[PDB]
Amino acid sequence: SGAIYVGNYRVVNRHLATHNDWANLVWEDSSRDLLVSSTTAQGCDTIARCDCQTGVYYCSSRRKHYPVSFSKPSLIFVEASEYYPARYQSHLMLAVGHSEPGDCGGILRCQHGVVGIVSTGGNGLVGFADVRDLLWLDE
Ligand SMILES: CSc1ccccc1CC(=O)N1CCC[C@](O)(C(N)=O)C1
Numbered sequence: 230s231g232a233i234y235v236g237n238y239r240v241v242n243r244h245l246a247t248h249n250d251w252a253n254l255v256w257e258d259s260s261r262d263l264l265v266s267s268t269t270a271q272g273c274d275t276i277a278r279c280d281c282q283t284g285v286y287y288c289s290s291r292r293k294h295y296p297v298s299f300s301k302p303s304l305i306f307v308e309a310s311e312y313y314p315a316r317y318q319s320h321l322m323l324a325v326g327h328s329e330p331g332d333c334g335g336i337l338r339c340q341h342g343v344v345g346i347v348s349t350g351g352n353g354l355v356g357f358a359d360v361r362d363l364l365w366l367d368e
Pocket residue numbers: 244262307310312313318328329330331332333347348349350351352
């Protein structure tokens with residue numbers, strides 16, 4: 230669990246979206262595992278607008294933050310699950326680090342702000358869904 234709260238938006242993993250998120254849907258992309266819904270109260274998270282490949286992520290399965298080097302956003306094969314058949318997820322960034330299924334939603338940050346949220350993992354690797362390109366989150 231976990232979300233990005235910026236302005237009047239709530240950014241979450243699409244496979245963990247609630248009924249309220251679908252009733253207040255702004256945008257969703259299955260290929261990116263992202264869903265953005267609207268909120269009545271303001272959000273104060275700052276989105277990083279950058280090309281950083283180092284940062285820190287929150288890992289709820291360990292209750293610890295971890296520094297990571299991560300790849301550039303791209304198309305990576307993600308194995309079939311109860312939410313998706315086997316497919317390439319786009320805008321995904323990989324790093325060496327611990328993750329477990331309940332870790333989706335943990336924020337990845339750099340000095341510039343929020344980079345994305347935990348989306349995939351397995352075998353000593355953790356995958357992050359990038360949000361830096363979603364310029365409309367600020368506007
Ligand atoms: C941090 S998730 C994780 C971590 C360690 C081991 C296994 C996982 C599960 C995992 O990767 N997914 C299952 C749910 C759907 C998924 O989020 C997607 N975007 O397709 C992928």
